Write an enzyme that holds these catalytic residues in place. Structure first.
Site, mmCIF file in Angstrom:
data_model
loop_
_atom_site.group_PDB
_atom_site.id
_atom_site.type_symbol
_atom_site.label_atom_id
_atom_site.label_comp_id
_atom_site.label_asym_id
_atom_site.label_seq_id
_atom_site.Cartn_x
_atom_site.Cartn_y
_atom_site.Cartn_z
ATOM 1 N N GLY A 163 0.769 -1.243 0.000
ATOM 2 C CA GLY A 163 0.000 0.000 0.000
ATOM 3 C C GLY A 163 0.804 1.299 0.000
ATOM 4 C CE1 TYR A 170 -6.770 1.821 0.085
ATOM 5 C CE2 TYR A 170 -7.645 0.955 2.151
ATOM 6 C CZ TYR A 170 -6.594 1.486 1.414
ATOM 7 O OH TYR A 170 -5.373 1.683 2.030
ATOM 8 C CG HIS A 269 -6.204 12.402 4.442
ATOM 9 N ND1 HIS A 269 -4.835 12.589 4.541
ATOM 10 C CD2 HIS A 269 -6.371 11.119 4.048
ATOM 11 C CE1 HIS A 269 -4.208 11.468 4.229
ATOM 12 N NE2 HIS A 269 -5.118 10.554 3.953
HETATM 13 O O1 LIG Z 1 -6.075 7.760 -0.268
HETATM 14 C C1 LIG Z 1 -5.793 7.891 0.963
HETATM 15 O O2 LIG Z 1 -4.810 8.538 1.418
HETATM 16 C C2 LIG Z 1 -6.692 7.216 2.027
HETATM 17 O O3 LIG Z 1 -6.419 7.377 3.218
HETATM 18 N N1 LIG Z 1 -7.715 6.466 1.653
HETATM 19 C C3 LIG Z 1 -8.463 5.729 2.653
HETATM 20 C C4 LIG Z 1 -7.532 4.580 3.195
HETATM 21 C C5 LIG Z 1 -7.845 4.271 4.691
HETATM 22 C C6 LIG Z 1 -7.201 4.954 5.725
HETATM 23 C C7 LIG Z 1 -7.520 4.665 7.064
HETATM 24 C C8 LIG Z 1 -8.483 3.709 7.427
HETATM 25 O O4 LIG Z 1 -8.797 3.461 8.764
HETATM 26 C C9 LIG Z 1 -9.314 2.114 9.000
HETATM 27 C C10 LIG Z 1 -8.412 1.045 8.889
HETATM 28 C C11 LIG Z 1 -7.112 1.141 9.421
HETATM 29 C C12 LIG Z 1 -6.186 0.086 9.316
HETATM 30 C C13 LIG Z 1 -6.564 -1.085 8.661
HETATM 31 C C14 LIG Z 1 -7.853 -1.175 8.120
HETATM 32 C C15 LIG Z 1 -8.781 -0.125 8.229
HETATM 33 C C16 LIG Z 1 -9.122 3.029 6.387
HETATM 34 C C17 LIG Z 1 -8.798 3.308 5.047
HETATM 35 C C18 LIG Z 1 -9.718 5.185 1.990
HETATM 36 O O5 LIG Z 1 -9.833 5.377 0.760
HETATM 37 O O6 LIG Z 1 -10.565 4.633 2.729
HETATM 38 NI NI NI Z 2 -4.590 8.518 3.586
#
Ligand SMILES: O=C(O)C(=O)N[C@H](Cc1ccc(OCc2ccccc2)cc1)C(=O)O
Ligand code: NI
Ligand SMILES: [Zn+2]
EC number: 1.14.11.66
Length: 346
Positions: A163, A170, A269
């Protein structure tokens, strides 16, 4: 130069587009990084994949069910790892009456129901899937190979970090969340929403990041004493009413199918998905990140173990400062307002 730190949008023509590192330096010369987050609408004839009809069979090895606990706009999210499942299964559940997007007028309305309901009926996020949806011959903005100086890591040590210098997919459904965070090592990130419902985003300007951590520490005093960088656990949720109420500046923006978002070093963010969707994502770098990489405050309790050796970057791009750095005496102060060196030509 974006003095109010607003989130900016760009529509690069097909040729402004072709060269990725230079389009990033361009938007930085235009002030974008100051918001922490920016949107780039690709030119209408660009396309990463002919069709998505064929993925119903793709495996999501480790979906997670998101349990959220909290009140008054402060929450902690716990991840339940569930059984493997294919996309078509994930889609069935996403679109089931149980899990699907409530009905709504304006975005502001869906935003209110998310904040009111995010502790109820915990959803499942098809998070962190190793792979890419780019046709193998697409050359512009292929998350598989942006070709930035982040590539120095794999090339010099062999080290790949899932990643970070490899792509994640996702798969979202309604009410799935991404907690407040900056990228590992304070890298940039890129997110392309291949399809489905929108993904909405909140962002704090890097020049106020420190103010968000100071705050988050008071809000979650227990977690702070056990780890400097607890936010890097990606478990902390904070609503815009709370930010607003403690005078922390932020902006909101909603990303649609076919749109790109870029995050900038140290840009905090967070957000949530509107419904069934699918985003792809990886981290990247520019010369300007190096200094953020040297200074990033890292998870001290070893939940977040990701850690890139800076040596290669300092030696190669900050020759003069290598020895001062190495004997731990490099005192440069970051100025979150400067575009990256690569931008001069603009
Ligand atoms: O493009 C990005 O920088 C970004 O942060 N995207 C986010 C990726 C993300 C970031 C943090 C998250 O928190 C929950 C989580 C944290 C660790 C493992 C599994 C889920 C979940 C997903 C998205 O598309 O959901
Ligand atoms: Ni991010
Ligand atoms: Zn930690």
């Amino acid at each position: 130069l974006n003095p109010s730190a607003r989130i900016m949008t760009f529509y690069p023509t097909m040729e402004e587009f072709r060269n990725f590192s230079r389009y990033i330096a361009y938007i930085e010369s235009q002030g974008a990084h100051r918001a922490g987050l920016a949107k780039v609408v690709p030119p209408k004839e660009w396309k990463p994949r002919a069709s998505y009809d064929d993925i119903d069979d793709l495996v999501i090895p480790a979906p997670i069910q998101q349990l959220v606990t909290g009140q008054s706009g402060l929450f902690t999210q716990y991840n339940i790892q569930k059984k493997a499942m294919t996309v078509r299964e994930f889609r069935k559940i996403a679109n089931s009456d149980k899990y699907c997007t409530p009905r709504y007028s304006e975005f502001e309305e869906l935003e209110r129901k998310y904040w009111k309901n995010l502790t109820f009926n915990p959803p499942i996020y098809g998070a962190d899937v190793n792979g890419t949806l780019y046709e193998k011959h697409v050359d512009e903005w292929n998350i598989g190979r942006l070709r930035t100086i982040l590539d120095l890591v794999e090339k010099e040590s062999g080290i790949t970090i899932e990643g970070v210098n490899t792509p994640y997919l996702y798969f979202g459904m309604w009410k799935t969340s991404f907690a407040w965070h900056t990228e590992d090592m304070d890298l940039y990130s890129i997110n392309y929403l291949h399809f489905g419902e929108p993904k909405s985003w909140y962002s704090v300007p890097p020049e106020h990041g420190k103010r968000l951590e100071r705050l988050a520490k008071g809000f979650f005093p227990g977690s702070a004493q056990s780890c400097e960088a607890f936010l890097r656990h990606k478990m902390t949720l904070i609503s815009p009413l709370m930010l607003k109420k403690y005078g922390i500046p932020f902006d909101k923006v909603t990303q649609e199918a076919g749109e790109f978002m870029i995050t900038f070093p140290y840009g905090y963010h967070a957000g949530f998905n509107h419904g069934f969707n699918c985003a792809e994502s990886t981290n990247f770098a520019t010369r300007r990140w190096i200094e953020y990489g040297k200074q990033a405050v890292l998870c001290s309790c070893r939940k977040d173990m990701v850690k890139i050796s800076m040596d290669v970057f300092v030696r190669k791009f900050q020759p003069e400062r290598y020895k001062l750095w190495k004997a731990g005496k490099d005192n440069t102060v970051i100025d979150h307002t400067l575009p990256t060196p690569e931008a001069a030509e603009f």
